[PDB]
Symmetry: D2
Subunit: 494 residues, 4 copies
């Protein structure tokens, strides 16, 4: 079932959230938030800058002090607070899904059934880890008792993207809080609204003040203050590889803060001749077109064995011609707008390069509508490796389909990129499934599927698609700092 | 027993090591290597620069290719090769300890009994992990089989310091090789010799070509080529916090390579009134003066409770006046030289600041001898927190002793530094031992001891003393890259 | 705050629970359930026997079949069902605490504040593990892909004691269900009632039918049917060491089912001269007298250093004379009855042996009241090692206090028992705390405390106090069965 | 290459090994050891009985005492001793392989290339774990510091089978010693000799006295003394399911010692129509006929899809007719004798049942030669599920081949046994490989292979094929005993 909000959405939370209270910006300035489907202003939000980030860090630092409620409470109680927060997001699911759709240009069906479900499920997963984070006792050489503490790191600056505002907010704060950190969150300038509603729920759930602080504002100002801050211990960022480089540089230049990055991709699929063809067509299609192509895992290079290539292209094109564009709140609509002008312009520019560089336009290839940042769903066949559409992350509804005849070569071509977020392998051959997935230089390899993401799995990039992993058991390591304690004793025994 | 080499040391290995063969530098240039005890040139070594680092990376990359001997061999066989290398270092222990002492200005007794023992033991520990590096199978939501591979990362650039050339070489290459990486090692410009001997043993042990490549040369040239290299996947560096910042910046600027850093410290000890006094005096003394103070963990701020402060200072000063300075090869000598002019000048400058800023000079405080970079063992009492000798890493035989009356305050003072490598707590109180060690912002906290390092423990800094951990179970994580493989199935069962 | 049930308790659930429905016994027989405070019959309950256990196993086996809802549901959803069950127990906390107090002779204050809190907390802990149970991927020798599945074992027969009916029900079913097993629970003949209420909540929460089956009845009939059953995969039992031996024998004789046992103890405390005396007196007192002494961890031998022995005995005796005996539902009452006649008779017999064998009776030593199985709180000093009260588990409010002068000897005396459930060490000496706790042959050693139990810790006996551990990360291993899957491939890569 | 011993084998070690010295039996009795290929007596060996087991346990107990060399030595040094033992077995490989072949009736080629290689490799694997056995630090509720120690269990009685004397000796002692236990080993009455040679190497390697004690003798006497012993903490047994039941009973009856069992099987293979046929034929053939069929994993029921059944039977029969029977020391011989008369008689009896119950004899079916316990390699087709040869472990060179048409049904038939050691699945279908292996109730499932065993994998049975696992990370758990230490503190921090 797909239920809907019965009254119109009223925007309430538009301020900076520090020590569980609502703050005007230090400057007093505010910035507009827009609906990408209408190009109309929804509201104004307080514009946080370096001075506001500074207030947030002081609050996070104080909440992190030895003897504070957040440091001293039972790990099980940090878990309890996270599960309570998940219950509250579940209570406000209609409200949050509507706001997410309206602000983010995100199909409401997906916002409600996928984004909100994933947000609730990830929080509950993270809640479960809280009192299961454990160090070791270690049989060191000599007469010593050695143990380790897996402590929280401290204050964690977290910069959230616009493409999955709620999901990414929870992917950041869930593990950080489960491990006992305090956070300073900087939601995307395009999509601050749902994060600020979640802040109200953090207060309601009973988190101690300063444990979660949310400073909306811009990248170059608030994001650059977080990255260069001398008392932020760690920064996590999801976004473009370009900005990831600048984050990593500012961390090294300032206080050597720990850095994790989830960045873009140019993720390949390899479709062997023996693949289940309609399954491969459907998953590759959804793999590239999901959320108007605005996924870092977008399956933006599809390599198909020559003998099934024409049939793959044909089936793919017919699937791509079945969309209904429009406002993402209207039922039956199956493709919303792109997030803003900058992204819209980038996508159209890259579509034009595909045309100019000699790719075969199968469908789409231009804008749509009288308002909103809409781009027609586009398919290119006969794509070659030095084309811009084969090398650059488009972040739009633009599919590239390529042929191959040699498996050795297509693996090289798949790996011949500075990216490495994910990949897809489609085959009925057991040996090929295992050997190809082993050889691909990508963080997640899907076999006979694509875009399957769950809280129980680690997720992140090889190469310039990122540093570190999120979620799973393994992701939690990056929100702890290991302390070794070695105690002199008279005599040890095994 | 302390055995010695029966014939004089002959230097054999002075060339760049790539694909298990000895290479002249591309330029043809060579650089001098000196003995810090005599200031005399021992030999010339080939000067590697960006062009040589480029050759080494290509060799490491080729050895890392899917289907290569190093990728395809049993994990147990990578372990076997490491244990064989440890056996060979054990065979050449006299030779290596002598060379280490001669080149590094390191007391031979310590070089033989500690450095070489630690080198052999760490390698054997690392060898044991090789076929115990494991991913997971994960009960993901939905009908999927999900597993993870903990793969080697790939080509790892490793920059080794001059203070423990052999130990640090093994701390880098042992875990990297155990996990299946290939390496490009850049030993310190001051101490290339023992690394090049180990390279000959890597060949003898039977490691495939290109798995370990060693390029001697300078920091600004060879180190900056490694840090900015577009096909190096990871960089590990031990050294000054200053250079660590530049490494982290160059990694972000170039290819977002993974970075681990073990950097300096200003490590504190807290000595409570109830402490075993002579134990605390002895460990704090060795904690600061070991290897002419040239340890990143140097216990360079010693806080002592007021009532035992005078007695602690008295006992410490008498311990510090018992050294015999001279050539580190002569038996009975108990303090060698500093490594070079740059470090020598820095130490004397900081000693002069202590005098000028009003610290109480208890002993030492000047140079020694007619040749060699010797500094008298120096003790300052009545040190205050804004003195240069309390804030800056000296990296010399210079002890600082401070008084405290409040435990709350001394913990704040201990933590009031951008460093955080290690710390010492001396007390008979169980509760104090546990609570103080928990509250200290340091990677290793010793209780009633100091400088106890073993292969089974993770080791590394909080804050600007580093990123990541070395050794232990936990250290091995940073030499793997996690890949998630998610396979569509018809029906899963628990 | 201590809230109470506003109306009188009405007993509703008195039947056998199979496939989420209420069953009469196959024979049609029923057995009486009593209140140990009044000796009055509360109700009748259906008497399950081998024929009913057989029906329960068939139901558990069917729920465990490949393709069943319980096998195929997301691990996260097994977790969700457990957290929902915890919410329901929390909703019915007053009801359950009252029933537990009334049926079990358990102080209501403790039943509400401790037992019910522990029950809710343990379930929530277990819920968190459900989708965090993971196998491995393993770098086996040769060209193979090897992974492991940590599968549920299957049908688990679980025999629950009368002393903590609710807590022990949850300690059994929580981990078993989290791991994906199905269960056949056999609550104590004395205390079936709270388990049957929880069964109604298992139905309400939405667990699939047959996942949890509860067969009340006697030990020799229903317990012996479970232990000897040919299609029960595992048996877990908490109870006397005597019956544990019979369970282990019947498992070996029948189908080699896996066995875990948590059995009795004769747990020692060692109180050194430097101990915080009133802390040691208070914890040792609570350690032996908690729940009328009916805890397997009862601190039933207290060894005190000679110089503080007289003062320890004095303070202990005055603490023991402060109880108010009576109905465990009346506020202000601080000691309830023993569970039944058999236990009552055993306790009085052992008290008489202490008198006859020459122990010094400090207080108590006889029965109390006109009805209920009440025993005066009793303290013996000058206890020696060959007395019955020093060797045999009393399971009653009977404290034994002994002197020692040698630490070597008292450790030997502490370890000189076939039991080994737990122990207590009281000292201010760091070295003694670590070395004594290492040397004691006991599963849980408390330092400067006693009886501190939490869901995050493994718990179980050394020697004849048990096989296996419950709770913690480690406890979950015993509710999985490891399957290795090794797949031939053409070429492996690291 | 296959090198051979240059002089004839001389038997040296024939005595009981206690405290690293050679002991006559207490009775003075000795028992004969035979060559199964000639039926000739090789030597006499001291017959250990309960009195000798008692001496061994006292020695093991003393070596296990707190403060002993084995308890106090570095974990890394226990590892060193194991790697040294592996080096010594490698030195004596020719000698040991020859003795193993001669005493065990085991093909020399296999004894040298497989058994000895596996023995050396498993020891080296186990050596690596020694200083990697670690407990935890745990964020318990309340103000406590909680850690766990993964201690050795203590004295471990280990009963070794005759089919792989050396491999099984090492599978037992390697993990037990790595974890810090002491052992009392009881090699098979048929094959004591190689174990006693290894005992001499344990002395040479420098293991402390009493750490390894070896008591040769019979099952009903020495094995029953170990199983019922009141001061043996754990028993591990590999052998028949029949004796496993008696071990488990005697453990429960005596001191509740921990029990692990690796018992027989009736392991199935499922060969789907799409399988690589010659690969499936070859692996299934080796799966049943390896070491004269005397493997607990013997692939003794082969289910083949109807359409390829006739061709599978044909190819299997031709493979089975290619053996050369004779003395296992003669090169070119490819099938040795069975171990003794009891096993020989059992095999022939079961072959006769196959004939009488209506199975189709394809080849073999009788004895061979004038001396030695030789049985012709035998193949039965058209085997049905209620035949003795389909239900009972034969432990001989006797292959059973069955047809199936339904996959649902053949899985039920495969699982319809009280055994569950291992299984084989042969298919090219990815989904079938994963789903069938998940559904099979067996400890190891091989996919497109069979009998692939390595030290890095856990190994053991489901159901009546065993309790617990050996080797791998998971196997090491069963040689530790977990102790929780919970320390009261003033205030905890995360
Ligand atoms: C909503 C999903 S995430 C998710 N689902 C997707 C994508 C493309 N197609 N689909 C169906 C995608 O790119 N993400 C995503 C991945 C990483 C970071 C952010 C978003 C989820 C699932 C389980 C738990 C939480 C979130
Ligand atoms: C030689 C030791 S390391 C070692 N031993 C020391 C130090 C100061 N006093 N002492 C006795 C010290 O700073 N290091 C060290 C620590 C980290 C990196 C490099 C060196 C060792 C021990 C065990 C295994 C390997 C190496
Ligand atoms: Cl993982
Ligand atoms: Cl750790
Ligand atoms: Cl544990
Ligand atoms: Cl495992
Ligand atoms: Yb299909
Ligand atoms: Yb427009
Ligand atoms: Yb002392
Ligand atoms: Yb000079
Ligand atoms: Yb006190
Ligand atoms: Yb009575
Ligand atoms: Yb083939
Ligand atoms: Yb014969």
């Amino acid at each position: 079932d797909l239920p809907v909000l019965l009254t119109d959405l009223k925007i309430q939370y538009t301020k900076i959230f520090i020590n569980n209270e609502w703050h005007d910006s230090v400057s007093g300035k505010k910035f507009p938030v827009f609906n990408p489907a209408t190009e109309e202003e929804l509201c104004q939000v307080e514009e946080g800058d370096k001075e506001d980030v500074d207030k947030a860090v002081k609050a996070a630092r104080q909440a992190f002090q030895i003897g504070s409620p957040w440091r001293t409470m039972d790990a099980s109680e940090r878990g309890r607070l996270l599960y309570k927060l998940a219950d509250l997001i579940e209570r406000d699911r209609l409200l949050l899904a509507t706001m997410e759709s309206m602000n983010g240009g995100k199909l409401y069906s997906n916002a409600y059934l996928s984004d909100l479900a994933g947000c609730i499920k990830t929080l509950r997963y993270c809640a479960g880890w809280a009192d299961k984070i454990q160090g070791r006792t270690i049989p060191i050489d000599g007469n010593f008792f050695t143990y380790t503490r897996h402590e929280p790191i401290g204050v964690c600056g977290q910069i959230i993207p616009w493409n999955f505002p709620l999901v990414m907010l929870i992917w950041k704060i869930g593990p950080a809080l489960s491990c006992g950190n305090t956070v300073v969150v900087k939601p995307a300038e395009q999509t601050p609204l749902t994060a600020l509603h979640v802040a109200s729920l953090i207060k309601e759930a009973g988190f101690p003040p300063g444990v979660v602080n949310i400073v909306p504002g811009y990248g170059p100002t608030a994001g650059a203050a977080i990255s260069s801050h001398m008392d932020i211990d760690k920064v996590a960022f999801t976004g473009s590889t370009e900005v990831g480089k600048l984050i990593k540089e500012a961390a090294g230049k300032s206080n050597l803060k720990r850095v994790t990055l989830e960045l873009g991709g140019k993720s390949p699929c390899i479709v062997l001749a023996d693949a289940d063809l309609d399954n491969a067509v459907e998953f590759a299609h959804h793999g590239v077109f999901y959320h108007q192509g605005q996924c870092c895992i977008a399956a933006s290079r599809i390599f198909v064995e020559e003998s099934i290539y024409d049939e793959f292209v044909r089936r793919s094109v017919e699937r791509a011609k079945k969309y209904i564009l429009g406002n993402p709140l209207t039922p039956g609509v199956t493709q919303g707008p792109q997030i803003d002008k900058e992204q819209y312009d980038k996508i159209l520019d890259l579509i034009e390069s595909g045309k100019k560089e000699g790719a075969k336009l199968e469908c789409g290839g231009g804008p749509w509508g009288n308002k909103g940042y809409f781009v027609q769903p586009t398919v290119f066949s006969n794509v070659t490796d030095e084309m811009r559409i084969a090398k650059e992350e488009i972040f739009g509804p633009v599919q590239q389909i390529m042929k191959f005849k040699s498996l050795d070569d297509v693996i090289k071509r798949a790996n011949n990129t500075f990216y490495g977020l994910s990949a897809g392998v489609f085959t009925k051959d057991i040996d090929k499934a295992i050997t190809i997935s082993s050889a691909l230089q990508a963080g997640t390899v899907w076999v006979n599927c694509y875009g399957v993401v769950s809280a129980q799995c680690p997720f992140g990039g090889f190469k310039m698609s990122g540093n570190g992993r999120e979620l799973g058991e393994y992701g939690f390591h990056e929100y702890t700092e290991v302390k070794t304690v070695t105690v002199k004793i008279s005599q040890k025994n095994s």
